[PDB]
Design a protein around this ligand. Structure first.
Ligand code: MET
Ligand code: ZN
Ligand code: ZN
Length: 598
């Protein structure tokens, strides 16, 4: 805990320079567009499937992780566009719509609102939260398809598929029964005979049956399109070899990507026999659509396009734009292989991802989230617990599954709330603001820095730079702890100086009390901005209580500044956090535990 004289003297200088170090801000732009010469940060979160209510695992892995970095990116004055939206096409949407007695468009409109409401409550600051079911999706999907077709990256072949003429549909291996051509087992599945173990193709079945209507399916050759990834594999590895090293792709994402390439890429079918999907502009495909995962990633582009005319300045400008993509592990192959191949094969100067951020999975307690069994906290339930959104944000981010899986624990939430928020972070900021309001009439006291004060000030600056160091590489988990480290330093500073005692003392002792008090609240002011990407409501609350000027609230410099000079008037202070009670938590834990199921 010992620095250099140069370190201490440098940090002090930057501090004393004050609010004059602050570039008067730039007016907010709508739409946000890339600005030449400056850093332009494009951020996408994986588009959640619309017809499933998201749980805390989904949220922390994608929208919440992306939001933290998005908010940090704005504090660094980077031109930031954070976009997301609902993934809506697919067979599951047709199955769920029918089950709910609605049209696919109806059930999508319904659940899109549910998603948006959940993300609003969690305070996810999307610049756009769009939809994949738009005319612009069809247009952009078809264009990219056309660019790939004429360059010979699309194959066309026929597939023998069992079709039930009564159900008027092609059958999945799990919907077809039949007798085994290898052992004669009369009730074999289309995928496997459980009797002799043989892995089969459904068409090999004798006397096939549709397990829905029990009719006899007939073999039909249907036309299908394919993306020739083997022909695109070369240019994909050239791009990967150019961009992976020195990047901040999460280790798991890199491994998965290189792992798929080690096997070798295969031709992927990009068409489906469906009605709900982006239509294929080709002869004889009037009743087929693009496969969801072929154009779901194109949704990123179409969502941006519904937002602005100049969407190609973001998505076709790799020289000015650094793309960050946040997703879960299972989404990586589509973002690191499928879409890059499609984009590179289209040869339209596309912005490709620079840093892929893929998290491990968040477990609920000792198991997994399950709407089926009533286990776990889902996004629509979190609003009803009496626990504020920022408390959810803090804890989920404190245990964000980066290197390995993590598990949500009600017991741990209570401990971390009471220890880190109440008895640490909140305690420091409460005392800081309280001392100004009580001892100095709400005016920040004069600050006469001792050598020990300069050390603290320099230590705070180093933690701030460490904080920057981490969040610059999307180390969200560790930067949060950096915040708590500064706060823990501040509590020690207050405790040893005992300003609330010294204030009732000699001429000299009252000056020390004021210096400590003033420096403390300037640290509090800094903490509020650092906390902004994590707990935006509390951040604003602190800034309201301290009346921190809007320009100081909008930027985070790499140096600890004096944002509250001597004579600055603060507002009215009030305890930041509430204690979490044991009875309160046991009740919530029993509610989401599964033992109260139906
Ligand atoms: C274009 S990202 C789509 C991700 C998909 N909706 C999922 O939840 O896995
Ligand atoms: Zn068999
Ligand atoms: Zn049938």
């Amino acid at each position: 805990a010992t620095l250099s004289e140069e370190e201490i003297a440098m940090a002090v200088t930057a501090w004393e320079k004050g609010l004059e170090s602050l570039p008067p801000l730039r007016p907010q732009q709508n739409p946000v567009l890339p600005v030449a010469g400056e850093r332009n940060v494009l951020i996408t979160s994986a588009l959640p499937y619309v017809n499933n209510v998201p749980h805390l695992g989904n949220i922390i892995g994608c929208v919440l992780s992306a939001d933290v970095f998005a908010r940090y990116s704005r504090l660094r004055q980077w031109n930031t566009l954070y976009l997301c939206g609902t993934d809506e096409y697919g067979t599951a949407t047709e199955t769920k719509a029918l089950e709910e007695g609605l049209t696919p468009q109806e059930i999508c409109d319904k659940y899109h609102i549910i998603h948006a409401d959940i993300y609003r409550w969690f305070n996810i600051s999307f610049d756009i939260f769009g939809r994949t079911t738009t005319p612009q999706q069809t247009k952009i999907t078809q264009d990219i398809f056309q660019q790939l077709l004429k360059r010979g990256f699309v194959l066309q072949d026929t597939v023998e598929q069992l079709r039930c003429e009564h159900c008027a549909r092609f059958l999945a291996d799990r919907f077809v029964e039949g007798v085994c051509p290898f052992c004669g087992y009369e009730e074999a599945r289309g995928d496997q005979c459980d009797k002799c173990g043989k892995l089969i193709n459904a068409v090999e079945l004798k006397k096939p049956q549709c397990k829905v209507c029990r009719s006899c399916p007939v073999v039909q050759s249907s036309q299908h399109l394919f993306l020739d990834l083997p022909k695109l594999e070369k240019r994909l590895e050239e791009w990967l070899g150019r961009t992976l090293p020195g990047s901040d792709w999460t280790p798991n994402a890199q491994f998965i990507t290189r792992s798929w390439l080690r096997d070798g890429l295969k031709p992927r079918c990009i068409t489906r026999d469906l009605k709900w999907g982006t239509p294929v502009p080709l002869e004889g495909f009037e009743d087929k659509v693009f496969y969801v995962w072929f154009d779901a990633t194109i949704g990123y582009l179409s969502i941006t396009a519904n937002y602005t005319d100049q969407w190609e300045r973001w998505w076709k400008n790799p020289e000015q734009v650094d793309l960050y993509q946040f997703m879960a592990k299972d989404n990586v192959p589509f973002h690191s292989l499928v879409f890059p191949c499609s984009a590179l094969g289209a040869e339209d100067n596309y912005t490709l991802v620079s840093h892929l951020i893929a998290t491990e999975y968040l477990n609920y307690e000792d198991g997994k989230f399950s709407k089926s069994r009533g286990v776990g906290v889902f996004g629509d339930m979190a609003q009803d617990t009496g626990i504020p959104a920022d408390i959810w944000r803090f804890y989920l981010l404190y245990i964000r599954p980066e290197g390995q899986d993590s598990a949500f624990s009600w017991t741990d939430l209570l401990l971390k709330n009471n220890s880190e928020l109440l008895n640490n972070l909140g305690n420091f900021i409460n005392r800081a603001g309280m001392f100004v309001s009580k001892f100095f009439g709400g005016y920040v006291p004069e600050m006469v820095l001792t050598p020990d004060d300069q050390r603290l000030l320099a230590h705070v600056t180093l933690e701030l730079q460490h904080y920057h160091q981490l969040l610059e590489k999307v180390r969200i988990r560790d930067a949060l702890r950096s915040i708590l480290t500064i706060s823990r330093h501040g509590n020690q500073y207050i405790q040893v100086n005992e300003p609330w005692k010294r204030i009732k003392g000699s001429e000299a002792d009252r000056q020390r009390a004021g210096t400590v008090t003033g420096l403390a609240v300037n640290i509090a002011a800094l903490l509020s901005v650092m906390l902004q990407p994590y707990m935006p409501t509390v951040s604003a609350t602190i800034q309201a209580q301290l009346q921190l000027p809007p320009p100081a609230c909008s930027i985070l410099l790499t140096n600890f500044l004096c944002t509250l000079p001597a004579g600055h008037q603060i507002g009215t202070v009030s305890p930041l956090f509430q204690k979490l009670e044991n009875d309160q938590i046991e009740s919530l834990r029993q509610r989401f535990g599964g033992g109260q199921a139906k």
